Amino acid sequence: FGKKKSATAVAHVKAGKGLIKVNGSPITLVEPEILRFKVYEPLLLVGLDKFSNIDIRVRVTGGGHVSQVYAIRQAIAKGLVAYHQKYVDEQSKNELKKAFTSYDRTLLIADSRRPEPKKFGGKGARSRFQKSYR
Amino acid sequence: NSKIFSPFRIIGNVSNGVPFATGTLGSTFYIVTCVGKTFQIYDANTLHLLFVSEKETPSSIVALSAHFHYVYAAYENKVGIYKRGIEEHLLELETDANVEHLCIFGDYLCASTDDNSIFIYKKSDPQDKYPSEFYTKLTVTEIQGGEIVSLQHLATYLNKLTVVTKSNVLLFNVRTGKLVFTSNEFPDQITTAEPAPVLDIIALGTVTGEVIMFNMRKGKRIRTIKIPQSRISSLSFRTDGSSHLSVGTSSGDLIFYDLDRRSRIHVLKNIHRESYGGVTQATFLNGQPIIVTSGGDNSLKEYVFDPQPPRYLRSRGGHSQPPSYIAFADSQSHFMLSASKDRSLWSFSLRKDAQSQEMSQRSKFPEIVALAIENARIGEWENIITAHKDEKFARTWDMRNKRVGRWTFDTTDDGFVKSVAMSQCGNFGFIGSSNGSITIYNMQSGILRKKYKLHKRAVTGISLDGMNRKMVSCGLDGIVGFYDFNKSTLLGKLKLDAPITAMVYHRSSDLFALALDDLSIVVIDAVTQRVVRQLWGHSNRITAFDFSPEGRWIVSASLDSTIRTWDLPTGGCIDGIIVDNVATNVKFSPNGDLLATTHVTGNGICIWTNRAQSTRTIDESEFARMALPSTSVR
Numbered sequence: 001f002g003k004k005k006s007a008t009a010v011a012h013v014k015a016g017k018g019l020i021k022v023n024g025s026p027i028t029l030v031e032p033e034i035l036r037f038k039v040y041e042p043l044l045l046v047g048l049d050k051f052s053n054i055d056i057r058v059r060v061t062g063g064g065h066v067s068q069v070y071a072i073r074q075a076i077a078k079g080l081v082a083y084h085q086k087y088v089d090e091q092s093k094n095e096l097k098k099a100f101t102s103y104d105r106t107l108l109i110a111d112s113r114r115p116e117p118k119k120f121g122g123k124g125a126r127s128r129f130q131k132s133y134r
Numbered sequence: 135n136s137k138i139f140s141p142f143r144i145i146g147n148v149s150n151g152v153p154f155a156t157g158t159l160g161s162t163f164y165i166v167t168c169v170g171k172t173f174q175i176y177d178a179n180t181l182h183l184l185f186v187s188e189k190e191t192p193s194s195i196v197a198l199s200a201h202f203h204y205v206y207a208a209y210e211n212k213v214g215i216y217k218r219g220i221e222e223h224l225l226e227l228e229t230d231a232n233v234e235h236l237c238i239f240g241d242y243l244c245a246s247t248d249d250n251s252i253f254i255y256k257k258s259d260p261q262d263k264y265p266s267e268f269y270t271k272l273t274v275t276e277i278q279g280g281e282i283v284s285l286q287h288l289a290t291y292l293n294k295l296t297v298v299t300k301s302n303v304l305l306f307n308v309r310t311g312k313l314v315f316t317s318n319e320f321p322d323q324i325t326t327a328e329p330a331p332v333l334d335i336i337a338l339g340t341v342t343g344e345v346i347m348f349n350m351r352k353g354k355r356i357r358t359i360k361i362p363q364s365r366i367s368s369l370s371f372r373t374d375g376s377s378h379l380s381v382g383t384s385s386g387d388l389i390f391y392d393l394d395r396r397s398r399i400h401v402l403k404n405i406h407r408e409s410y411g412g413v414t415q416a417t418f419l420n421g422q423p424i425i426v427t428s429g430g431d432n433s434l435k436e437y438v439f440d441p442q443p444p445r446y447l448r449s450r451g452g453h454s455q456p457p458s459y460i461a462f463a464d465s466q467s468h469f470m471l472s473a474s475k476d477r478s479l480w481s482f483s484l485r486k487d488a489q490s491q492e493m494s495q496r497s498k499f500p501e502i503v504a505l506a507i508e509n510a511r512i513g514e515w516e517n518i519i520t521a522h523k524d525e526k527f528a529r530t531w532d533m534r535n536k537r538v539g540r541w542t543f544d545t546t547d548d549g550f551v552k553s554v555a556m557s558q559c560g561n562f563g564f565i566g567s568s569n570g571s572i573t574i575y576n577m578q579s580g581i582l583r584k585k586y587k588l589h590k591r592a593v594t595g596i597s598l599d600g601m602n603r604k605m606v607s608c609g610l611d612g613i614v615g616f617y618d619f620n621k622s623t624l625l626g627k628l629k630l631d632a633p634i635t636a637m638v639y640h641r642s643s644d645l646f647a648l649a650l651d652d653l654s655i656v657v658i659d660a661v662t663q664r665v666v667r668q669l670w671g672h673s674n675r676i677t678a679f680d681f682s683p684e685g686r687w688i689v690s691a692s693l694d695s696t697i698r699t700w701d702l703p704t705g706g707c708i709d710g711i712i713v714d715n716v717a718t719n720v721k722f723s724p725n726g727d728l729l730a731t732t733h734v735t736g737n738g739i740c741i742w743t744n745r746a747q748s749t750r751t752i753d754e755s756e757f758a759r760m761a762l763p764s765t766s767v768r
Binding site: 090091092 | 579583
């Protein structure tokens, strides 16, 4: 349900079991790794109220790599708290939420940044080419 | 005499069992019921409260009759003559006997007494509004007949009063004094009598279920209908074209019989409680297919015949037993929610029309043992929670549709519900268990939100501050629990010296009071989690208590038959009232204007005016011995 700086991650919500697959995989993998956490850290981040739950998982895809990674990010907890009451918490879903966003920036809504704009100049944007007429 | 409270009025009274009267109202009819020492007058076609007698009689009203625009009410050796609830005249019979029966016809007023005398008063001039001059005194000696059961006037019987006794039927000429007729002995005791809509015929009910059509002219039976194993308590003929007869019984049944087809039409089963006399009166309205019924169970019902079995049309009533729990339903002083041991939940209006309505339970639910209501979410979802005797779940109700709600809230620890509460926002319901658990439910979805386990004995009180920050509880273990609502942390515990039986939380001041078995009232600050005051004075078990809206006062009631006012800045009792009828509930109106009390005897709710909206001087035996408000007010 959440897109990230030219990327976009979709949310799956309806109670089930373990193995929450991202794309069509398993937030065990998610191999653009290094910072492979911050993904498993939404679920881990559940460290504030829940321990893992027993629910669902969906696929992302847009822009490029770390973009996507950051997208699947919100994607998750931006879908634990899912309305609710069949998804979030049948009452006071600020349970997670305010907790899963008292140290967040992914589920903590998205960033007002997004690529565009250049210039009749050099590279463009602001970096206008280097000229030194004599 | 009290410095704070002065009696205003009583709410929720409709009928007490005295057979209601019917009179003429322009084109429509009016119904006169008895409330005790007061009568009330309703429209027969709407059941709108038209009048209430402005001044209480010295003793309980025993008999009611209506004649045109005048109401005749019997009590002691007297007959009061009223118009528009206002006494226009008082007849004091020259006797120490009590009036039992009345009959008004022609220029005459006939009032029989419990020594078988019949006092006859007469109009001086036929165009007088009512009889006022004593004319004569008839007597039915035991050889002439038995104990007088009823006085009736048959159509076209000029100057002739029909006096039906337990054993026979007499006919007196009240002008000449002559006993012109006396029937043969009746074998079985006559309990009821009713003029038939045809010449010379009177219907007589017996202790055995027999209705006898008797011809006064020829002095013989014409017809005898048997109602198996019933005791007849009322008779009335339908007069809209259908030759039907209604027979009320002491068991609370109303039987409809076709006189022409000689068959039982129908029977309304248990429309009035048998333990309160069953059907004490049932009357077809003249020219209408409508029958009005009543009993001693504080209800007045109306049944119709559509152009087929009779169909419930409308009714008015209150509790048949004293209210056990009450609450103001709103901040506009519109409704009060009230529960009684008669297993009913009612909403009573505080306004002039005295409207009321029982909460639909669509054999009743067990008696309510705890009640909570919040007006915030009215219409949106359930806003009432009730605990029921020996049940492990609380029920919910909807104030908008005056009906039971969708959810039941289980204790989860196999205990009974002993306390209930609600958030001010109306989002949450709180349930306290006899096993110690506290459960928090979502009023919108019915889902269990949170569960706490601190108490090891019954939780007798629960509440939450207006900002939903801190939750407080009390129990028979003498523990006061303080919890964080947003998390589930135990914020603290207090251990009091006695079992705690009840809690009242004051949301605008964040103080809450507790009633203890040691007869004290403990006041605690929820913010500091400390006891700030302790009130000593009552000599018996505390029944109820409440905060004055400002937070300055606490008013309390007890088995000691007192109602006391406590000033919190000093902790001293600044006013005390001694009642002859123990108060079981005391509640302040949301605005400081009124005080509602419920008592051990009486079906209604007493309203008091807080005329102190005062000194801080202590009291002792300077308490006022005040009587409850008059039923004649408003």
